[PDB]
Amino acid sequence: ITGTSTVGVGRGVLGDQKNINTTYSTYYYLQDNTRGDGIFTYDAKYRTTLPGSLWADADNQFFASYDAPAVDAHYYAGVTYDYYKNVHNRLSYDGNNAAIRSSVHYSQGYNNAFWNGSEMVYGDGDGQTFIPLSGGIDVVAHELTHAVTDYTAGLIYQNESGAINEAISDIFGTLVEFYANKNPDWEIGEDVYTPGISGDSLRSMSDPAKYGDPDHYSKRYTGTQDNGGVHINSGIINKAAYLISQGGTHYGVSVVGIGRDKLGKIFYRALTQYLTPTSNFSQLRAAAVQSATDLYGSTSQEVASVKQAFDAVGVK
Numbered sequence: 001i002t003g004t005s006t007v008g009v010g011r012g013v014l015g016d017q018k019n020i021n022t023t024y025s026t027y028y029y030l031q032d033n034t035r036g037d038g039i040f041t042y043d044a045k046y047r048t049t050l051p052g053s054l055w056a057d058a059d060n061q062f063f064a065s066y067d068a069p070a071v072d073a074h075y076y077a078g079v080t081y082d083y084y085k086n087v088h089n090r091l092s093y094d095g096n097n098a099a100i101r102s103s104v105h106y107s108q109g110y111n112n113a114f115w116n117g118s119e120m121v122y123g124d125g126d127g128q129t130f131i132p133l134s135g136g137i138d139v140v141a142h143e144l145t146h147a148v149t150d151y152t153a154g155l156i157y158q159n160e161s162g163a164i165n166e167a168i169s170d171i172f173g174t175l176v177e178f179y180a181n182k183n184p185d186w187e188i189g190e191d192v193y194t195p196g197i198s199g200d201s202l203r204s205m206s207d208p209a210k211y212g213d214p215d216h217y218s219k220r221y222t223g224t225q226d227n228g229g230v231h232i233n234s235g236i237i238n239k240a241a242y243l244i245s246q247g248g249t250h251y252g253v254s255v256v257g258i259g260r261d262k263l264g265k266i267f268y269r270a271l272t273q274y275l276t277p278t279s280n281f282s283q284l285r286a287a288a289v290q291s292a293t294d295l296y297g298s299t300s301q302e303v304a305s306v307k308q309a310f311d312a313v314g315v316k
Protein backbone atom coordinates (compact mmCIF):
# COMPACT_ATOMS: atom_id res chain seq x y z
CA ILE A 1 0.00 0.00 0.00
CA THR A 2 1.16 3.65 -0.77
CA GLY A 3 -0.06 6.23 1.78
CA THR A 4 0.62 8.32 4.80
CA SER A 5 2.43 6.82 7.87
CA THR A 6 0.44 7.33 11.10
CA VAL A 7 -0.04 5.71 14.44
CA GLY A 8 -3.18 3.83 15.62
CA VAL A 9 -4.05 2.39 19.05
CA GLY A 10 -5.50 -1.00 19.92
CA ARG A 11 -5.91 -3.66 22.57
CA GLY A 12 -3.97 -6.93 22.35
CA VAL A 13 -5.05 -10.54 23.21
CA LEU A 14 -4.16 -10.00 26.92
CA GLY A 15 -6.40 -6.83 27.08
CA ASP A 16 -3.35 -4.50 27.07
CA GLN A 17 -3.43 -1.18 25.23
CA LYS A 18 -0.69 -0.38 22.74
CA ASN A 19 0.15 2.02 19.85
CA ILE A 20 0.80 0.45 16.48
CA ASN A 21 2.40 1.84 13.22
CA THR A 22 -0.24 1.97 10.42
CA THR A 23 -0.59 3.50 6.85
CA TYR A 24 -3.37 5.64 5.71
CA SER A 25 -4.83 5.44 2.23
CA THR A 26 -8.70 5.60 2.35
CA TYR A 27 -8.55 2.94 5.03
CA TYR A 28 -5.93 2.58 7.77
CA TYR A 29 -3.78 -0.53 7.07
CA LEU A 30 -1.62 -2.69 9.36
CA GLN A 31 1.48 -1.65 7.43
CA ASP A 32 4.47 -0.26 9.42
CA ASN A 33 6.76 1.77 7.15
CA THR A 34 9.30 2.55 9.85
CA ARG A 35 11.03 -0.73 9.95
CA GLY A 36 13.11 -1.96 7.02
CA ASP A 37 10.95 -2.59 4.05
CA GLY A 38 7.75 -2.72 6.26
CA ILE A 39 5.89 -4.99 8.59
CA PHE A 40 2.54 -6.16 7.12
CA THR A 41 -0.29 -7.97 8.96
CA TYR A 42 -3.06 -9.85 7.11
CA ASP A 43 -6.50 -11.25 7.85
CA ALA A 44 -6.74 -14.97 6.87
CA LYS A 45 -10.57 -14.87 7.77
CA TYR A 46 -10.66 -18.41 9.25
CA ARG A 47 -9.39 -19.86 6.04
CA THR A 48 -6.10 -21.62 5.14
CA THR A 49 -5.45 -19.63 2.01
CA LEU A 50 -2.37 -17.34 2.58
CA PRO A 51 -1.69 -14.51 3.15
CA GLY A 52 -5.29 -13.34 3.11
CA SER A 53 -6.17 -9.59 2.90
CA LEU A 54 -3.85 -6.85 4.12
CA TRP A 55 -5.59 -5.71 7.34
CA ALA A 56 -7.86 -2.65 6.78
CA ASP A 57 -9.66 -0.65 9.39
CA ALA A 58 -11.84 2.38 9.07
CA ASP A 59 -10.80 4.51 12.00
CA ASN A 60 -7.25 3.51 13.14
CA GLN A 61 -8.67 2.19 16.47
CA PHE A 62 -8.31 -1.59 17.03
CA PHE A 63 -10.44 -2.39 20.06
CA ALA A 64 -12.70 -5.14 18.69
CA SER A 65 -12.10 -8.69 19.83
CA TYR A 66 -11.51 -9.74 16.29
CA ASP A 67 -8.65 -6.98 16.11
CA ALA A 68 -6.64 -8.38 19.14
CA PRO A 69 -4.46 -11.07 17.43
CA ALA A 70 -3.61 -8.71 14.51
CA VAL A 71 -2.58 -5.90 16.98
CA ASP A 72 -0.19 -8.23 18.84
CA ALA A 73 1.22 -9.97 15.77
CA HIS A 74 1.93 -6.50 14.22
CA TYR A 75 3.41 -4.93 17.42
CA TYR A 76 5.47 -7.98 18.51
CA ALA A 77 6.93 -8.39 15.04
CA GLY A 78 8.11 -4.68 15.45
CA VAL A 79 9.77 -5.46 18.83
CA THR A 80 11.53 -8.53 17.42
CA TYR A 81 12.79 -6.47 14.38
CA ASP A 82 14.12 -3.99 16.92
CA TYR A 83 15.78 -6.55 19.12
CA TYR A 84 17.68 -7.98 16.07
CA LYS A 85 18.74 -4.58 14.78
CA ASN A 86 19.65 -2.97 18.10
CA VAL A 87 21.28 -5.93 19.73
CA HIS A 88 22.87 -7.84 16.83
CA ASN A 89 22.93 -5.22 14.22
CA ARG A 90 20.87 -7.45 11.80
CA LEU A 91 18.36 -5.78 9.57
CA SER A 92 15.27 -7.99 9.37
CA TYR A 93 15.47 -11.80 9.03
CA ASP A 94 17.54 -11.84 5.93
CA GLY A 95 19.87 -9.12 6.97
CA ASN A 96 18.70 -6.87 4.15
CA ASN A 97 15.50 -5.41 5.52
CA ALA A 98 13.05 -7.98 3.96
CA ALA A 99 9.40 -7.17 4.61
CA ILE A 100 7.99 -9.09 7.45
CA ARG A 101 4.52 -10.58 6.91
CA SER A 102 2.14 -12.26 9.32
CA SER A 103 -1.39 -13.69 8.87
CA VAL A 104 -3.80 -14.05 11.87
CA HIS A 105 -7.17 -15.93 12.17
CA TYR A 106 -5.81 -18.86 10.23
CA SER A 107 -8.20 -21.81 10.04
CA GLN A 108 -10.70 -22.55 12.83
CA GLY A 109 -9.61 -23.40 16.36
CA TYR A 110 -5.93 -23.92 15.09
CA ASN A 111 -3.66 -24.62 18.02
CA ASN A 112 -0.39 -23.55 16.57
CA ALA A 113 1.73 -20.80 14.94
CA PHE A 114 4.47 -21.43 12.26
CA TRP A 115 6.87 -19.95 9.70
CA ASN A 116 5.95 -21.25 6.23
CA GLY A 117 9.26 -20.50 4.38
CA SER A 118 7.88 -17.03 3.64
CA GLU A 119 5.62 -15.55 6.38
CA MET A 120 4.44 -16.12 9.89
CA VAL A 121 0.97 -17.72 10.50
CA TYR A 122 -1.03 -17.69 13.75
CA GLY A 123 -4.00 -19.83 14.79
CA ASP A 124 -6.62 -18.40 17.20
CA GLY A 125 -6.41 -21.57 19.40
CA ASP A 126 -9.50 -23.51 20.40
CA GLY A 127 -9.97 -21.37 23.53
CA GLN A 128 -8.83 -23.97 25.99
CA THR A 129 -5.59 -25.39 24.99
CA PHE A 130 -4.56 -21.93 23.67
CA ILE A 131 -5.78 -18.46 23.09
CA PRO A 132 -4.69 -16.70 19.89
CA LEU A 133 -1.04 -17.43 19.52
CA SER A 134 0.31 -13.92 18.66
CA GLY A 135 -0.53 -12.87 22.24
CA GLY A 136 2.85 -14.31 23.40
CA ILE A 137 5.93 -12.35 22.58
CA ASP A 138 8.16 -15.49 22.94
CA VAL A 139 5.79 -17.23 20.37
CA VAL A 140 6.16 -14.24 17.83
CA ALA A 141 10.00 -14.21 18.31
CA HIS A 142 10.28 -18.03 18.10
CA GLU A 143 8.51 -17.75 14.68
CA LEU A 144 10.64 -14.91 13.27
CA THR A 145 13.79 -16.58 14.50
CA HIS A 146 12.92 -19.61 12.29
CA ALA A 147 13.26 -17.09 9.32
CA VAL A 148 16.61 -15.92 10.76
CA THR A 149 17.93 -19.55 10.94
CA ASP A 150 16.56 -20.36 7.50
CA TYR A 151 18.63 -17.43 6.06
CA THR A 152 21.86 -18.24 8.09
CA ALA A 153 22.75 -21.78 9.25
CA GLY A 154 19.84 -23.34 7.32
CA LEU A 155 19.47 -26.16 9.89
CA ILE A 156 17.41 -29.07 8.36
CA TYR A 157 14.18 -29.67 10.32
CA GLN A 158 14.86 -33.15 11.47
CA ASN A 159 16.72 -35.10 14.08
CA GLU A 160 19.69 -33.27 15.80
CA SER A 161 19.90 -30.31 13.44
CA GLY A 162 16.16 -29.85 13.77
CA ALA A 163 16.24 -29.86 17.57
CA ILE A 164 19.10 -27.22 17.35
CA ASN A 165 16.72 -25.24 15.03
CA GLU A 166 13.93 -25.43 17.66
CA ALA A 167 16.36 -24.55 20.64
CA ILE A 168 17.60 -21.40 18.74
CA SER A 169 14.01 -20.22 18.25
CA ASP A 170 13.24 -20.90 21.99
CA ILE A 171 16.51 -19.17 23.06
CA PHE A 172 15.97 -16.02 21.02
CA GLY A 173 12.29 -15.95 21.72
CA THR A 174 13.14 -15.87 25.46
CA LEU A 175 15.88 -13.16 24.93
CA VAL A 176 13.35 -11.03 23.02
CA GLU A 177 10.88 -11.51 25.97
CA PHE A 178 13.54 -10.25 28.38
CA TYR A 179 14.49 -7.45 25.96
CA ALA A 180 10.90 -6.14 26.05
CA ASN A 181 10.75 -6.75 29.83
CA LYS A 182 7.40 -8.20 29.39
CA ASN A 183 7.24 -10.33 32.68
CA PRO A 184 10.20 -12.38 31.39
CA ASP A 185 11.00 -15.97 32.27
CA TRP A 186 12.65 -19.09 30.95
CA GLU A 187 9.38 -20.75 29.99
CA ILE A 188 7.81 -20.96 26.51
CA GLY A 189 4.21 -19.98 25.51
CA GLU A 190 3.02 -19.30 29.10
CA ASP A 191 0.97 -16.24 28.20
CA VAL A 192 -1.18 -18.05 25.63
CA TYR A 193 -1.21 -21.68 26.86
CA THR A 194 -4.23 -23.24 28.76
CA PRO A 195 -6.01 -20.18 29.77
CA GLY A 196 -7.61 -22.08 32.52
CA ILE A 197 -4.50 -23.46 34.26
CA SER A 198 -2.09 -21.08 35.85
CA GLY A 199 1.57 -21.48 36.11
CA ASP A 200 2.15 -23.92 33.31
CA SER A 201 3.70 -23.43 29.86
CA LEU A 202 4.31 -25.38 26.73
CA ARG A 203 8.01 -26.02 27.48
CA SER A 204 10.47 -25.10 30.17
CA MET A 205 14.10 -24.06 29.48
CA SER A 206 14.98 -23.95 33.21
CA ASP A 207 13.62 -27.44 33.68
CA PRO A 208 12.65 -29.25 30.51
CA ALA A 209 11.77 -32.38 32.51
CA LYS A 210 8.81 -30.64 34.21
CA TYR A 211 6.78 -31.43 31.03
CA GLY A 212 8.64 -34.65 30.12
CA ASP A 213 11.33 -33.34 27.84
CA PRO A 214 14.95 -34.58 28.16
CA ASP A 215 17.48 -32.45 30.16
CA HIS A 216 20.36 -34.78 29.43
CA TYR A 217 21.68 -36.40 26.14
CA SER A 218 21.35 -39.77 27.69
CA LYS A 219 17.61 -39.26 27.71
CA ARG A 220 17.34 -38.13 24.10
CA TYR A 221 14.29 -39.34 22.04
CA THR A 222 15.45 -41.70 19.22
CA GLY A 223 12.12 -42.24 17.57
CA THR A 224 10.27 -40.99 14.67
CA GLN A 225 7.58 -38.73 15.71
CA ASP A 226 7.90 -34.96 15.55
CA ASN A 227 10.45 -35.20 12.88
CA GLY A 228 12.62 -37.26 15.17
CA GLY A 229 11.77 -35.24 18.28
CA VAL A 230 12.65 -31.70 17.19
CA HIS A 231 10.44 -30.20 19.83
CA ILE A 232 11.49 -32.85 22.41
CA ASN A 233 15.27 -32.99 22.13
CA SER A 234 15.48 -29.22 21.96
CA GLY A 235 15.14 -29.47 25.79
CA ILE A 236 18.84 -30.76 26.02
CA ILE A 237 20.05 -27.48 24.29
CA ASN A 238 17.57 -25.17 26.11
CA LYS A 239 18.82 -26.44 29.49
CA ALA A 240 22.44 -25.91 28.26
CA ALA A 241 21.60 -22.30 27.26
CA TYR A 242 19.77 -21.64 30.54
CA LEU A 243 22.88 -22.92 32.52
CA ILE A 244 25.36 -20.73 30.58
CA SER A 245 23.21 -17.71 31.32
CA GLN A 246 22.06 -18.37 34.85
CA GLY A 247 24.49 -20.91 36.29
CA GLY A 248 23.66 -23.97 38.50
CA THR A 249 24.66 -27.58 39.27
CA HIS A 250 23.01 -30.16 37.05
CA TYR A 251 23.69 -33.84 37.45
CA GLY A 252 26.60 -32.96 39.70
CA VAL A 253 28.32 -30.64 37.12
CA SER A 254 28.69 -26.97 38.32
CA VAL A 255 28.31 -23.96 35.83
CA VAL A 256 29.10 -20.38 36.60
CA GLY A 257 26.50 -18.19 34.87
CA ILE A 258 27.76 -15.43 32.40
CA GLY A 259 24.30 -13.83 31.93
CA ARG A 260 21.88 -13.17 29.09
CA ASP A 261 23.62 -10.74 26.93
CA LYS A 262 26.71 -12.86 26.55
CA LEU A 263 24.51 -15.92 25.96
CA GLY A 264 22.77 -14.06 23.03
CA LYS A 265 26.13 -12.86 21.67
CA ILE A 266 27.73 -16.28 21.68
CA PHE A 267 24.61 -18.06 20.19
CA TYR A 268 24.14 -15.42 17.43
CA ARG A 269 27.75 -15.74 16.41
CA ALA A 270 27.56 -19.62 16.34
CA LEU A 271 24.30 -19.35 14.32
CA THR A 272 25.62 -16.83 11.71
CA GLN A 273 29.21 -17.93 11.39
CA TYR A 274 29.79 -21.57 12.38
CA LEU A 275 26.62 -23.69 12.16
CA THR A 276 25.64 -25.52 8.88
CA PRO A 277 22.44 -27.28 7.60
CA THR A 278 23.48 -30.61 9.10
CA SER A 279 25.16 -29.57 12.35
CA ASN A 280 24.56 -31.97 15.24
CA PHE A 281 24.72 -31.38 19.03
CA SER A 282 28.45 -32.08 19.21
CA GLN A 283 28.95 -29.60 16.38
CA LEU A 284 26.87 -26.98 18.20
CA ARG A 285 29.17 -27.48 21.20
CA ALA A 286 32.30 -26.75 19.05
CA ALA A 287 30.61 -23.74 17.38
CA ALA A 288 29.57 -22.25 20.72
CA VAL A 289 33.11 -22.77 22.26
CA GLN A 290 34.73 -21.21 19.18
CA SER A 291 32.32 -18.17 19.30
CA ALA A 292 32.98 -17.60 23.00
CA THR A 293 36.79 -17.97 22.16
CA ASP A 294 36.51 -15.36 19.37
CA LEU A 295 34.70 -13.01 21.60
CA TYR A 296 36.23 -13.44 25.05
CA GLY A 297 39.55 -15.37 24.61
CA SER A 298 40.38 -18.98 25.16
CA THR A 299 41.08 -18.62 28.70
CA SER A 300 37.98 -16.64 29.43
CA GLN A 301 35.45 -17.67 32.10
CA GLU A 302 32.96 -17.37 29.19
CA VAL A 303 34.63 -20.17 27.37
CA ALA A 304 34.86 -22.13 30.64
CA SER A 305 31.06 -21.77 31.33
CA VAL A 306 30.16 -22.92 27.79
CA LYS A 307 32.21 -26.22 28.22
CA GLN A 308 30.65 -26.85 31.68
CA ALA A 309 27.08 -26.25 30.48
CA PHE A 310 27.55 -28.81 27.62
CA ASP A 311 29.28 -31.33 29.90
CA ALA A 312 26.38 -30.85 32.30
CA VAL A 313 23.80 -32.05 29.65
CA GLY A 314 25.99 -34.77 28.33
CA VAL A 315 27.01 -33.12 25.02
CA LYS A 316 30.46 -34.28 24.55
Ligand SMILES: CC(C)C[C@H](NP(=O)(O)O)C(N)=O
Pocket (backbone or CB within 6 Å): 112, 113, 114, 115, 133, 138, 139, 142, 143, 146, 188, 189, 202, 231
Ligand atom coordinates in the same frame (compact mmCIF):
# COMPACT_ATOMS: atom_id res chain seq x y z
C1 LIG B 1 6.11 -21.79 20.09
C2 LIG B 1 4.81 -22.60 19.93
C3 LIG B 1 3.47 -21.91 20.21
C4 LIG B 1 4.60 -22.93 18.48
C5 LIG B 1 5.71 -23.70 17.76
N1 LIG B 1 5.41 -23.89 16.35
P1 LIG B 1 6.74 -24.25 15.11
O1 LIG B 1 6.10 -25.00 14.00
O2 LIG B 1 7.32 -22.83 14.76
O3 LIG B 1 7.86 -25.03 15.92
C6 LIG B 1 5.90 -25.02 18.49
N2 LIG B 1 5.19 -26.04 18.14
O4 LIG B 1 6.68 -25.01 19.45
Ligand SMILES: [Ca+2]
Pocket (backbone or CB within 6 Å): 057, 058, 059, 060, 061, 062, 063
Ligand atom coordinates in the same frame (compact mmCIF):
# COMPACT_ATOMS: atom_id res chain seq x y z
CA1 LIG C 1 -11.47 0.14 14.03
Ligand SMILES: [Ca+2]
Pocket (backbone or CB within 6 Å): 177, 182, 183, 184, 185, 190, 191
Ligand atom coordinates in the same frame (compact mmCIF):
# COMPACT_ATOMS: atom_id res chain seq x y z
CA1 LIG D 1 6.63 -14.34 30.45
Ligand SMILES: [Ca+2]
Pocket (backbone or CB within 6 Å): 138, 174, 177, 184, 185, 186, 187, 188, 189, 190
Ligand atom coordinates in the same frame (compact mmCIF):
# COMPACT_ATOMS: atom_id res chain seq x y z
CA1 LIG E 1 8.13 -17.03 28.22
Ligand SMILES: [Ca+2]
Pocket (backbone or CB within 6 Å): 190, 193, 194, 195, 196, 197, 198, 199, 200, 201
Ligand atom coordinates in the same frame (compact mmCIF):
# COMPACT_ATOMS: atom_id res chain seq x y z
CA1 LIG F 1 -1.87 -21.81 31.38
Ligand SMILES: [Zn+2]
Pocket (backbone or CB within 6 Å): 142, 146, 166, 169
Ligand atom coordinates in the same frame (compact mmCIF):
# COMPACT_ATOMS: atom_id res chain seq x y z
ZN1 LIG G 1 9.55 -23.85 16.09
